[PDB]
Write a structure and sequence with these properties.
The structure is a homodimer. With 387 residues, the first copy, chain A, is α/β, with parallel strands linked by helices. The first copy, chain A, is built from twelve helices and 14 strands. In chain A, 54% of the residues are buried.
Chain lengths: 387, 386
């Protein structure tokens, strides 16, 4: 390679992933990487620091142009720069738009099993989660279009929070699927909030259909949310972008961001995100490569040594969604037992709700050597359940 | 000799609010400095960048110990570390507590003229500003205690956002005033939100009285501090709420997390710790530079521009200047002044109160720029009388 995907960065003590760990514990749960970031991003941060003064920052149009250029090169989708609004984070943007575009007690539709923070921002703000569960009929998840529409048509259902690609299952919806969802939301005057934070991480050539691509009129009912944070290992950068074609909605969300305190970039957000989106193409190409190898190793080891589990077919994200149902153990119990016996820490599916009690989520955005370790620890833990 | 550099203006990138989008124009409006930051802080930032991976951060105990140590050494007031909660900014913290601790339609009290952003977070959140106006007589502002108490007594008045020290008039309240304001709030079951972001910048020995030091009324107060104004780190997005009431404190923190302002960014923790552990010497030199700038500016406006009156102040690097004798609304004056001289200062109108008669001037810049701006101000006033 041209980039380091071998050495795990040495964090300071206050890391969520690596902080507070017992000796030899291996964290493979929270969605951040154990890879150093792109040097082109690093250079922009070191460059910014040399200003040696960190007063108030505006969002320059270069930021919106970088977002537009990135979306077109990586996704063959180009937003109008005018549609774009800076937010310091995807989840806080959802939180603010929940408060601005729905009322206390309104229902907000999700597709379970879905990312836990969806529930935290809906319920934490006093809105009610309603799910049109994704059907787990094969080794696959699919949409009940009848059930989805009738829930969308419920008057108290005011918003749909859509994970595109879908986390934790790792599925980049098809162009027909995204467009059909956005048409159904428009038809029932439901706002479609499309969380596309995993959108740069499709591992197949099947690229994402960003919600803002839907044709006009329905385009007036969508928001796309992106960030460099998952793509480039920049969770603590606090840079993100809302893409809102409807300009009334856009002006209202921009004010909601300002009032939440998430509308103003910190000292590194602008130059670092611009560098990521202008210069991070080559580092991401190699990243997906390392991800595809770790998934290939992961799937083969588990097929040959832990056939009682099943790594689901996934086409996006660095998170493996593993069916542990045949182990007969609740995911959280299994994950606890795993850490206790082997020191391997992975994400229980329970918090994603849906059928997550039968699933674990494993973070493969780490050097192959840590995948080898983690896969060996999983098997050791499965074997002792039998002894 | 100064150990630090207060002579060279930082070379900013294009998206600077103060210096972006400007030939020869001189911005002295928005409250950020034109000095380099303390090298002890820069060292901490460059060390954190070597991690070269910026995943999720916790708030370490060393952050709160740094805040407590700083408050004890600079202000003779050590908060309990348990009372301390990280927030990504003072104004976002105010805004979150408006939403969490008041209802839509409740009134929130301020003392006009005061920071424009207070109105934005109150009004934009669907609460109603109520002001107990400061009384302007003798070129001094005074608190109308009777009006203050009657308004705090109003059932719909549920929160007071207090600026301590007060922006834009530059006044560090006395110990008596802070405690009285806290006791009046507590008496009426009103939350006192004490924005103490200018607290380290009292340019005299006169010190600030943090709201957290009020007698065990202490259950009704929140002190908000940050290194941002003190060390020229607005965009660092590091702040700290000091909340002695443990239940109020946990609710505020929950509100910060829900809003997206409870998690530190990649530099907030090490940089704030360095500022609060190793920034004492730099701050002491800064205050000598600021006193020198104010001495020159006050003398130069008193001797050369008798048409304006700089109000007496003891805190902040901002000067509050009565321009009423020019007979011109401050918004229009500031527009004309920019057109004729290139000097950009803050019109008083947005601070409400009697701000239509005032301008605000930021003197936290090298003395060469202070000289330039003061001379341009005279140029603009002379251009009016001619």
């Amino acid at each position: 390679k041209q980039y380091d995907f071998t050495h795990v960065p040495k964090r300071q003590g206050n890391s969520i992933k690596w902080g507070g760990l017992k000796e030899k514990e291996l964290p493979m749960w929270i969605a951040e990487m154990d890879f150093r970031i792109a040097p082109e991003i690093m250079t922009s941060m070191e460059e910014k620091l040399k200003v040696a003064a960190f007063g108030y920052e505006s969002v320059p149009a270069e930021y919106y142009k970088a977002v537009a250029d990135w979306e077109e090169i990586e996704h063959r989708a180009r937003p109008k720069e005018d549609w774009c609004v800076f937010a310091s984070g995807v989840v806080p943007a959802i939180s603010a738009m929940v408060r601005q575009f729905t009322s206390p007690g309104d229902q907000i539709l999700v597709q379970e099993p879905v990312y836990n923070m969806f529930y935290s921002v809906i319920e934490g703000n006093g809105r009610r989660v309603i799910s049109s569960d994704l059907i787990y009929e094969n080794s696959k998840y699919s949409v009940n279009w009848a059930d989805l529409e009738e829930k969308l048509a419920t008057p108290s259902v005011r918003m749909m929070v859509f994970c595109n690609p879908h986390n934790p299952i790792g599925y980049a919806w098809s162009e027909e699927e995204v467009k059909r969802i956005a048409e159904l939301c428009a038809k029932h005057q439901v706002l479609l909030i499309s969380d596309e934070i995993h959108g740069d991480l499709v591992l197949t050539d099947e690229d994402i259909t960003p919600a803002f691509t839907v044709d006009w009129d329905a385009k007036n009912w969508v928001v796309s949310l992106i960030s460099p944070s998952k793509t480039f290992n920049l969770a603590a950068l606090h840079a993100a972008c809302a893409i809102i074609p409807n300009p009334d909605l856009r002006a209202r969300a921009e004010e909601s961001f300002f009032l939440a305190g998430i509308g103003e970039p910190n000292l590194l957000a602008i130059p670092a995100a611009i560098a990521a989106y202008e210069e991070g193409h080559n580092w991401l190409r190699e990243l997906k490569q390392v991800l595809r190898d770790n998934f290939a190793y992961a799937r083969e080891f588990l097929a040959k040594e832990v056939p009682e589990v099943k790594v689901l077919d996934s086409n996006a994200s660095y998170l493996a969604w593993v069916d542990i149902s045949a182990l007969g153990m609740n995911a959280e119990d299994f994950c606890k037992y795993l850490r206790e016996k082997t020191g391997l820490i992975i994400s229980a599916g329970n918090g994603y709700r849906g059928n997550g009690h039968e699933f674990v989520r494993i973070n493969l955005a780490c050097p192959k050597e840590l995948v080898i370790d983690g896969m060996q620890r999983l098997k050791q833990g499965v074997l002792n359940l039998n002894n």
